[PDB]
Amino acid sequence: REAAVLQKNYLETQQAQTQAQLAFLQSKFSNAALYNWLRGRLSAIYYQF
């Protein structure tokens, strides 16, 4: 039983680590929103050029 409680603590640690990776990818400067803006702006510039 105590081994299973440690396993649940391990899984909750993995949940918090997955959320930490997710928050890093949301909050990084080179996230998907920068590339959305970047290709939309460059697409407009590219058609006019």
* Binding stretches for another protein (CB under 8 A): 12, 15-16, 19, 22-23, 26-27, 31, 33
41 near 34, Cβ under 8 Å? no
Least distance CB 12 / another protein (angstroms): 8
Toward another protein, which CB reaches closer, 23 or 38? 23
Distance of alpha carbon 45 from alpha carbon 37, whole angstroms = 12
Question: Which residue shows structure tokens 């959320």?
Answer: 19
CB of 24 to another protein, least distance (A): 9
Whichever of 12 and 39 has its CB closer to another protein, that residue is: 12
Can you give the C-alpha Rg of the chain in angstroms?
20
